[PDB]
Design a protein around this ligand. Structure first.
Ligand code: RWG
Ligand code: RWG
Ligand code: RWG
Ligand code: RWG
Ligand code: ZN
Ligand code: ZN
Ligand code: ZN
Ligand code: ZN
Lengths: 197, 197
């Protein structure tokens, strides 16, 4: 009857958030983003993206770590796989590029849980937790993983981003604030048995 | 990198839906429902409910089996645990009481996956995928499980209910139609690798 995965959470105060050089997005606008997605689809087919959900707590209240681009969009750490790149090795690589330390000490990323899949049917913002009817060639597949943090860590945050710890209640039914993927993390995380260390 | 659970789906046409006597709810109204929840909480504490998600496909399109009370509310098969009753044995018992056969041949229910948890903080309709801030005594805890169906089965549907196969697209962002638990099943099922048999 204990069919739940057990996940260790640690206090937000256990983690050090340092700073490093800005990390710029490839796309300077929504229009460039969809143009590049069109160009690459014609060359290498469906875009494969991976995103990490990093959880902490304070006073036993779970929080998801989000990256805010200045004061604009909230994102999960992650991004685009290269062709033939393993999803888990790829998320580890991307989380090292985003939050990895300047002193080049390796973070020990632990990734043992897929928590969802989203599909983009067109070169357009809409994404669904399934392949919609009539769609044979989705343009992007996004895969979300739970990343188990160590007890303590130093994260180097690119200077153009803020690392925010968002409580689940703030995400819940807040698609306007966070969009349909981040806003459904409370439902996606509910199956986990969190230990508040 | 294959961190996904693999689930066998079978065509809706593999299953026979027979009929049996009506199965009446304990509560004749919302008001009686919340009155009984109040009375039992004072005697035995938090209500523990369990619900089964049964999935089929037709032409490779996943559908969730829902029970419609005539043409009114949609529900998952499940219900209330007795005090000290195991969650999995209890869901098996409840799914036998609801969909079990008149000839008394045993369904082989397979339950290996928790897919979420919902909490009711007050004697009121609102439910959340987490324990909200300030709430120490939640009045109900609802646990959802994925039920792996056999290749073929006969289900006896109480005559006062319709068994409907709902495609994921119909549930998605449809809280008004289905409420916050059923409407978030697409997100909760996205992590599964479905095999369309
Ligand atoms: C996928 C990637 C590279 C990149 C940017 N970020 C990032 C930074 C902060 C954050 F919260 C989430 C993602 N991670 N990787 N994106 C591009 O625009 C080019 C490219 O390949
Ligand atoms: C930031 C620092 C010094 C430092 C901090 N920590 C640490 C703290 C907390 C923790 F969890 C694990 C390590 N180690 N070294 N100075 C640099 O130039 C980079 C660098 O390393
Ligand atoms: C939990 C239960 C018994 C019961 C009713 N149903 C049911 C039928 C169809 C359906 F779709 C979902 C649930 N299952 N069990 N409910 C009561 O009102 C008394 C009681 O103990
Ligand atoms: C409904 C029926 C006859 C029947 C059908 N099946 C069957 C069909 C499909 C399947 F997947 C597994 C079994 N077996 N017996 N007559 C009664 O009085 C109850 C009863 O059993
Ligand atoms: Zn505390
Ligand atoms: Zn895909
Ligand atoms: Zn077919
Ligand atoms: Zn509880």
């Amino acid at each position: 009857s204990m069919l739940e995965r057990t996940i260790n959470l640690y206090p937000l105060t256990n983690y050090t958030f340092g700073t490093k050089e800005p990390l710029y997005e490839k796309d300077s606008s929504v229009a460039a983003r969809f143009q590049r997605m069109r160009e690459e689809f014609d060359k290498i087919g469906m875009r494969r993206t991976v995103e990490g959900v990093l959880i902490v707590h304070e006073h036993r209240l779970p929080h998801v770590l989000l990256l805010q681009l200045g004061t604009t969009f909230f994102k999960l750490p992650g991004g685009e796989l290269n062709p033939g790149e393993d999803e888990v090795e790829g998320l580890k690589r991307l989380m090292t590029e985003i939050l990895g330390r300047q002193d080049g000490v390796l973070q020990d990323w632990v990734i043992d849980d897929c928590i969802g899949n989203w599909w983009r049917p067109n070169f357009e913002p809409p994404q669904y937790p399934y392949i919609p009817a009539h769609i044979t060639k989705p343009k992007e597949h996004k895969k979300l993983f739970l990343v188990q943090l160590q007890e303590k860590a130093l994260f180097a945050v690119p200077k153009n981003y803020k690392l925010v710890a968002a409580p689940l209640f703030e995400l819940y039914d807040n698609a306007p604030g966070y969009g349909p993927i981040i806003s459904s993390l409370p439902q996606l995380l509910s199956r986990f048995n969190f230990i508040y260390n």
